[PDB]
Amino acid sequence: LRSEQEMMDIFLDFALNDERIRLVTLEFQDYDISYFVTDVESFKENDQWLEIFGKRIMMQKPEDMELFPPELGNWFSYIILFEDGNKLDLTLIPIREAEDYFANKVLLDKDSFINYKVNDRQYWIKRPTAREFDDCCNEFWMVSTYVVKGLARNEILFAIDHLNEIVRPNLLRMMAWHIASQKGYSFSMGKNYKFMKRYLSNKEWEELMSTYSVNGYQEMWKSLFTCYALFRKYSKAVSEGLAYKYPDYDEGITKYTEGIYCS
């Protein structure tokens, strides 16, 4: 079967662990993937490393055929028809040719040498600038007050939509920026943050999981405060690592929602 989720995980996960793969790009359910690598010939040694993607019905290597001359420059691709029914089209482009390529949807960049494209900038993650950093905190805490007012005014649905759509998503960006700090990579969270489980450790996923709680007004306050706790943690971690000023939004809003939560 293998859902579009499971398939993407495999390709993204593969690239992440392979040191020759520096950049990954995307584009019927067919998959169009491109790995920009350091040593193209390395992959060409043999076809064992391909077994990781699963059992296949058959495969075609367009630039390695006698009957059909190769004419895809320095590329080398594979067309695979998987047993589960999925079809993949994987191209191996030399990393040195990324610039040319770009010029005339990136998923992962391990070096970030080049600068480039974007309604997807919503999911794009890379080292924040002092300003971008401040922006994430500004939005987080500000929209956060909407959730407070929602719960205090009996508009739990109003509160829930802002929590799900803005507050938690910014906590995630903050966490992604932290991960990006470790490695120094740039990547996408994917449509609806679908790739985040593939970046967070199990501890970090459990923390994010803990921001979800069953229905109820009090359960909501809990979810919100949990996001608070985690946002401080990661924004402090990030601000500290890049030497950016820690905002005062935390403190200001903490006093605020505390004022309303109690009295």
PDB file of N, CA, C and O in Angstrom, residues 82-115:
ATOM      1  N   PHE A  82       7.278  -0.133  -7.881  1.00  0.00           N
ATOM      2  CA  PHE A  82       7.229  -0.911  -6.644  1.00  0.00           C
ATOM      3  C   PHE A  82       6.130  -1.966  -6.572  1.00  0.00           C
ATOM      4  O   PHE A  82       5.081  -1.844  -7.211  1.00  0.00           O
ATOM      5  N   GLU A  83       6.389  -3.009  -5.797  1.00  0.00           N
ATOM      6  CA  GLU A  83       5.414  -4.071  -5.637  1.00  0.00           C
ATOM      7  C   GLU A  83       4.112  -3.573  -5.035  1.00  0.00           C
ATOM      8  O   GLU A  83       3.040  -4.015  -5.431  1.00  0.00           O
ATOM      9  N   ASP A  84       4.213  -2.655  -4.077  1.00  0.00           N
ATOM     10  CA  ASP A  84       3.040  -2.107  -3.396  1.00  0.00           C
ATOM     11  C   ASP A  84       2.232  -1.249  -4.364  1.00  0.00           C
ATOM     12  O   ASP A  84       1.132  -0.810  -4.047  1.00  0.00           O
ATOM     13  N   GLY A  85       2.789  -1.013  -5.547  1.00  0.00           N
ATOM     14  CA  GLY A  85       2.089  -0.227  -6.543  1.00  0.00           C
ATOM     15  C   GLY A  85       2.674   1.141  -6.806  1.00  0.00           C
ATOM     16  O   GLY A  85       2.356   1.748  -7.827  1.00  0.00           O
ATOM     17  N   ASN A  86       3.522   1.645  -5.911  1.00  0.00           N
ATOM     18  CA  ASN A  86       4.080   2.968  -6.140  1.00  0.00           C
ATOM     19  C   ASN A  86       5.157   3.026  -7.214  1.00  0.00           C
ATOM     20  O   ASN A  86       5.859   2.045  -7.484  1.00  0.00           O
ATOM     21  N   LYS A  87       5.250   4.185  -7.851  1.00  0.00           N
ATOM     22  CA  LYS A  87       6.228   4.404  -8.899  1.00  0.00           C
ATOM     23  C   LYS A  87       7.103   5.574  -8.502  1.00  0.00           C
ATOM     24  O   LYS A  87       6.614   6.614  -8.069  1.00  0.00           O
ATOM     25  N   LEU A  88       8.408   5.396  -8.638  1.00  0.00           N
ATOM     26  CA  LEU A  88       9.330   6.455  -8.295  1.00  0.00           C
ATOM     27  C   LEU A  88      10.208   6.760  -9.489  1.00  0.00           C
ATOM     28  O   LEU A  88      10.473   5.891 -10.318  1.00  0.00           O
ATOM     29  N   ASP A  89      10.639   8.014  -9.561  1.00  0.00           N
ATOM     30  CA  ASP A  89      11.537   8.489 -10.591  1.00  0.00           C
ATOM     31  C   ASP A  89      12.599   9.259  -9.800  1.00  0.00           C
ATOM     32  O   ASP A  89      12.358  10.365  -9.334  1.00  0.00           O
ATOM     33  N   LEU A  90      13.762   8.648  -9.617  1.00  0.00           N
ATOM     34  CA  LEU A  90      14.849   9.256  -8.846  1.00  0.00           C
ATOM     35  C   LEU A  90      16.022   9.675  -9.708  1.00  0.00           C
ATOM     36  O   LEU A  90      16.567   8.866 -10.442  1.00  0.00           O
ATOM     37  N   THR A  91      16.421  10.935  -9.612  1.00  0.00           N
ATOM     38  CA  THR A  91      17.556  11.406 -10.393  1.00  0.00           C
ATOM     39  C   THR A  91      18.692  11.768  -9.462  1.00  0.00           C
ATOM     40  O   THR A  91      18.463  12.332  -8.398  1.00  0.00           O
ATOM     41  N   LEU A  92      19.911  11.424  -9.864  1.00  0.00           N
ATOM     42  CA  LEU A  92      21.111  11.732  -9.081  1.00  0.00           C
ATOM     43  C   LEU A  92      21.902  12.792  -9.842  1.00  0.00           C
ATOM     44  O   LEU A  92      22.580  12.507 -10.832  1.00  0.00           O
ATOM     45  N   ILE A  93      21.784  14.030  -9.388  1.00  0.00           N
ATOM     46  CA  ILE A  93      22.459  15.156 -10.008  1.00  0.00           C
ATOM     47  C   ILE A  93      23.715  15.531  -9.229  1.00  0.00           C
ATOM     48  O   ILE A  93      23.704  15.529  -8.005  1.00  0.00           O
ATOM     49  N   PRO A  94      24.823  15.834  -9.926  1.00  0.00           N
ATOM     50  CA  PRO A  94      26.037  16.208  -9.192  1.00  0.00           C
ATOM     51  C   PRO A  94      25.764  17.504  -8.411  1.00  0.00           C
ATOM     52  O   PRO A  94      25.182  18.450  -8.948  1.00  0.00           O
ATOM     53  N   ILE A  95      26.173  17.541  -7.148  1.00  0.00           N
ATOM     54  CA  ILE A  95      25.941  18.697  -6.299  1.00  0.00           C
ATOM     55  C   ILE A  95      26.486  19.991  -6.886  1.00  0.00           C
ATOM     56  O   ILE A  95      25.909  21.066  -6.697  1.00  0.00           O
ATOM     57  N   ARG A  96      27.597  19.879  -7.600  1.00  0.00           N
ATOM     58  CA  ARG A  96      28.222  21.031  -8.217  1.00  0.00           C
ATOM     59  C   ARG A  96      27.296  21.733  -9.220  1.00  0.00           C
ATOM     60  O   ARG A  96      27.509  22.897  -9.548  1.00  0.00           O
ATOM     61  N   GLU A  97      26.256  21.041  -9.685  1.00  0.00           N
ATOM     62  CA  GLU A  97      25.349  21.597 -10.693  1.00  0.00           C
ATOM     63  C   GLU A  97      24.015  22.113 -10.168  1.00  0.00           C
ATOM     64  O   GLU A  97      23.077  22.324 -10.944  1.00  0.00           O
ATOM     65  N   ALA A  98      23.936  22.312  -8.856  1.00  0.00           N
ATOM     66  CA  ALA A  98      22.722  22.794  -8.213  1.00  0.00           C
ATOM     67  C   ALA A  98      22.402  24.215  -8.644  1.00  0.00           C
ATOM     68  O   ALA A  98      21.274  24.520  -9.036  1.00  0.00           O
ATOM     69  N   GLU A  99      23.404  25.084  -8.556  1.00  0.00           N
ATOM     70  CA  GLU A  99      23.292  26.477  -8.947  1.00  0.00           C
ATOM     71  C   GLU A  99      22.700  26.605 -10.350  1.00  0.00           C
ATOM     72  O   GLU A  99      21.703  27.288 -10.539  1.00  0.00           O
ATOM     73  N   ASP A 100      23.326  25.927 -11.319  1.00  0.00           N
ATOM     74  CA  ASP A 100      22.865  25.963 -12.706  1.00  0.00           C
ATOM     75  C   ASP A 100      21.404  25.548 -12.721  1.00  0.00           C
ATOM     76  O   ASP A 100      20.554  26.222 -13.301  1.00  0.00           O
ATOM     77  N   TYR A 101      21.141  24.419 -12.071  1.00  0.00           N
ATOM     78  CA  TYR A 101      19.804  23.833 -11.974  1.00  0.00           C
ATOM     79  C   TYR A 101      18.762  24.819 -11.472  1.00  0.00           C
ATOM     80  O   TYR A 101      17.758  25.056 -12.158  1.00  0.00           O
ATOM     81  N   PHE A 102      18.992  25.352 -10.273  1.00  0.00           N
ATOM     82  CA  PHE A 102      18.097  26.317  -9.650  1.00  0.00           C
ATOM     83  C   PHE A 102      17.793  27.455 -10.607  1.00  0.00           C
ATOM     84  O   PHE A 102      16.636  27.662 -11.000  1.00  0.00           O
ATOM     85  N   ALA A 103      18.849  28.181 -10.967  1.00  0.00           N
ATOM     86  CA  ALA A 103      18.778  29.338 -11.871  1.00  0.00           C
ATOM     87  C   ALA A 103      17.729  29.172 -12.965  1.00  0.00           C
ATOM     88  O   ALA A 103      16.610  29.687 -12.845  1.00  0.00           O
ATOM     89  N   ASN A 104      18.090  28.439 -14.014  1.00  0.00           N
ATOM     90  CA  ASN A 104      17.174  28.194 -15.113  1.00  0.00           C
ATOM     91  C   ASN A 104      16.077  27.235 -14.661  1.00  0.00           C
ATOM     92  O   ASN A 104      15.687  26.315 -15.382  1.00  0.00           O
ATOM     93  N   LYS A 105      10.476  22.537  -5.677  1.00  0.00           N
ATOM     94  CA  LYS A 105      10.273  22.352  -4.235  1.00  0.00           C
ATOM     95  C   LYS A 105      11.410  21.639  -3.483  1.00  0.00           C
ATOM     96  O   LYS A 105      11.396  20.427  -3.367  1.00  0.00           O
ATOM     97  N   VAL A 106      12.376  22.396  -2.968  1.00  0.00           N
ATOM     98  CA  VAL A 106      13.486  21.834  -2.198  1.00  0.00           C
ATOM     99  C   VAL A 106      12.956  21.252  -0.893  1.00  0.00           C
ATOM    100  O   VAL A 106      12.068  21.831  -0.278  1.00  0.00           O
ATOM    101  N   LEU A 107      13.493  20.108  -0.479  1.00  0.00           N
ATOM    102  CA  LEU A 107      13.047  19.500   0.770  1.00  0.00           C
ATOM    103  C   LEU A 107      14.115  19.517   1.837  1.00  0.00           C
ATOM    104  O   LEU A 107      13.812  19.683   3.031  1.00  0.00           O
ATOM    105  N   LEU A 108      15.362  19.349   1.415  1.00  0.00           N
ATOM    106  CA  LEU A 108      16.497  19.351   2.332  1.00  0.00           C
ATOM    107  C   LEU A 108      17.749  19.906   1.692  1.00  0.00           C
ATOM    108  O   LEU A 108      18.071  19.598   0.543  1.00  0.00           O
ATOM    109  N   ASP A 109      18.446  20.733   2.462  1.00  0.00           N
ATOM    110  CA  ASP A 109      19.704  21.339   2.048  1.00  0.00           C
ATOM    111  C   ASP A 109      20.618  21.174   3.254  1.00  0.00           C
ATOM    112  O   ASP A 109      20.332  21.683   4.326  1.00  0.00           O
ATOM    113  N   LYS A 110      21.714  20.457   3.075  1.00  0.00           N
ATOM    114  CA  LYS A 110      22.617  20.215   4.186  1.00  0.00           C
ATOM    115  C   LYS A 110      23.722  21.232   4.314  1.00  0.00           C
ATOM    116  O   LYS A 110      24.314  21.374   5.384  1.00  0.00           O
ATOM    117  N   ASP A 111      23.972  21.964   3.236  1.00  0.00           N
ATOM    118  CA  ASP A 111      25.025  22.966   3.236  1.00  0.00           C
ATOM    119  C   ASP A 111      24.551  24.403   3.196  1.00  0.00           C
ATOM    120  O   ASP A 111      25.212  25.282   3.754  1.00  0.00           O
ATOM    121  N   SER A 112      23.426  24.643   2.525  1.00  0.00           N
ATOM    122  CA  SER A 112      22.853  25.981   2.435  1.00  0.00           C
ATOM    123  C   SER A 112      23.834  26.962   1.767  1.00  0.00           C
ATOM    124  O   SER A 112      23.917  28.122   2.162  1.00  0.00           O
ATOM    125  N   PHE A 113      24.584  26.496   0.774  1.00  0.00           N
ATOM    126  CA  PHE A 113      25.536  27.376   0.090  1.00  0.00           C
ATOM    127  C   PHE A 113      24.778  28.374  -0.775  1.00  0.00           C
ATOM    128  O   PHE A 113      25.110  29.568  -0.820  1.00  0.00           O
ATOM    129  N   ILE A 114      23.758  27.869  -1.457  1.00  0.00           N
ATOM    130  CA  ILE A 114      22.935  28.666  -2.359  1.00  0.00           C
ATOM    131  C   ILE A 114      21.726  29.288  -1.663  1.00  0.00           C
ATOM    132  O   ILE A 114      21.302  28.829  -0.588  1.00  0.00           O
ATOM    133  N   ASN A 115      21.201  30.342  -2.291  1.00  0.00           N
ATOM    134  CA  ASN A 115      20.012  31.056  -1.827  1.00  0.00           C
ATOM    135  C   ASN A 115      18.947  30.817  -2.912  1.00  0.00           C
ATOM    136  O   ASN A 115      19.283  30.706  -4.095  1.00  0.00           O
TER     137      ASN A 115
END
